[PDB]
Design a binder for this molecule. Structure first.
Ligand SMILES: Nc1nc(-c2cccc(Cl)c2)c(-c2ccc3ncccc3n2)s1
Length: 432
């Protein structure tokens, strides 16, 4: 009965989440700001019936913990679900850590105590996450020492996630038992052990050249503390990771027993871990940016041709401000974006579409350039072919496919690419 549009108005895109986009919205009466995840029913399949979802959402709205995201409302119309919740402006935990000069075992324990606090509370209320990862750890405020909020706790039991643009950075943290189908709340302890391992080394315990190679390592479940970074880390931290990364879930420690472990109650600097976590986060974010870029090029290519056909059928006189605005509503807030587009583009409908979308292409190029620049930590202007293999590995582009495309852009490259070349390689990888 309740309609979303009759209560909230969109302000700006906050980013992307799992199962849909996150928009910053404002209540039309009280002005309260909210983060709204919009889930398209055509793009996302329901694991359970509509009765099971309403009951889990009802329970989730009544739960309250300082380390769990607050869900306020839930709406559904013919083609979408709207999860309305609280706004957390501090960003993702790992983005805060890469900006820090120093990071110690006390900072890591403080983080993991919060993550385990949220989990324990949620396990007492029989909610499992399943997809606990760094992206689902948002900081309440801009500051470094701020409260961590776990996002999407309980969504996975009712929504199915395949697209490589999504699914990037998920294989590192997934519990082996989730892969074979029989899992319970202990899967969330495994994921926290993986995150804890990365916080104290900067490297995942189960790693590989591509998604499937990572999953092979996870499934075998063997890892080591046999890297130079672990020498400067205490045996009590190694003992907790061992208990949390125990293969058989019945033998694995509970989230509650992890809070009461010697390490969390008891707790220098881990410099090599910050350098590795910078590189890990840089690689993750560039691969993501590369996939978003290729996605935006096909979306714009589709939208330009679909909008041209609509504006051509609208053209009776062999152009018109009211007609140009009318065309945008046919392919679908949309009128206000058109009013801002027509005023800026002007400052022929064929010349309009090119400028209106070349503005959108420049915006798409600059987001990719930011992630390239941030990945290029030594400011060389280039990334090696080895760095490309890692990048194209995490974005699941086949080795022979990107190496072929590279020789087509520049035949006399010496195992390095500049930004323009990288951009040119991605355009060729999406039929452009
Ligand atoms: N995976 C993600 N899902 C959400 C989300 C949003 C609303 C409802 C629900 Cl159930 C989940 C995210 C979120 C939450 C707050 C945020 N606040 C400021 C910036 C980005 C934010 N993103 S990330």
């Amino acid at each position: 009965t309740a309609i979303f549009s009759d209560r909230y108005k969109g302000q700006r895109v906050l980013g992307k989440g799992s199962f849909g986009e996150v928009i910053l919205c404002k209540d039309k009466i009280t002005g309260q700001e909210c983060a709204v995840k919009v889930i398209s029913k055509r793009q996302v399949k329901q694991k359970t019936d509509k009765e099971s979802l309403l009951r889990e959402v009802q329970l989730l709205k009544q739960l309250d913990h300082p380390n769990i995201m607050k869900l306020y409302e839930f709406f559904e119309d013919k083609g979408y679900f709207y999860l309305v919740g609280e706004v957390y402006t501090g960003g993702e935990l790992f983005d805060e850590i890469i900006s820090r000069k120093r990071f110690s075992e006390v900072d890591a324990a403080r983080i993991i105590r919060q993550v385990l606090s949220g989990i324990t509370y949620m396990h007492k209320n029989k909610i499992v996450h399943r997809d606990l990862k760094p992206e689902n750890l948002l900081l309440e405020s801009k500051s470094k020492d701020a409260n961590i909020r776990i996002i999407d706790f309980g969504l996975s039991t009712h929504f199915e996630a395949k697209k490589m643009k999504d699914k990037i950075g998920t294989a590192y943290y997934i519990a082996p038992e989730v892969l074979h189908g029989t899992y319970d709340e202990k899967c969330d302890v495994w994921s926290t052990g993986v995150i804890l391992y990365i916080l104290l080394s900067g490297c995942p315990p189960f790693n590989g050249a591509n998604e499937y190679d990572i999953l092979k390592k996870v499934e075998k479940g063997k890892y080591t503390f046999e890297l130079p970074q672990w020498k400067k880390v205490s045996e009590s931290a190694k003992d907790l990771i061992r208990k949390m990364l125990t293969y058989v879930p019945s033998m694995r420690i509970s989230a509650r027993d992890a809070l009461d472990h010697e390490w969390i109650q008891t707790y220098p600097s881990l410099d090599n871990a910050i350098l590795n976590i910078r590189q890990f986060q840089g690689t993750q974010k560039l691969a993501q940016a590369a996939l978003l870029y290729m996605g935006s090029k096909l979306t714009s290519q589709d939208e330009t041709k679909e909008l041209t056909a609509i504006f051509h059928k609208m053209d009776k006189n062999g152009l018109d401000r009211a007609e140009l605005i009318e065309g945008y509503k046919e392919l679908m807030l949309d009128a206000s974006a058109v009013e801002h587009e027509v005023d800026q583009v002007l400052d022929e409908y064929s010349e309009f579409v090119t400028v209106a979308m070349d503005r959108k292409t420049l915006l798409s190029r600059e987001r990719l350039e930011r992630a390239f620049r941030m990945f290029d930590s030594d400011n060389s202007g280039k990334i090696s072919s080895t760095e490309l293999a890692t990048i194209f590995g995490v974005s699941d582009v086949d080795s022979e496919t990107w190496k072929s495309v590279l020789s087509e852009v520049d035949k006399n490259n010496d195992g390095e690419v500049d930004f323009d070349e990288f951009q040119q390689m991605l355009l060729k990888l999406c039929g452009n």
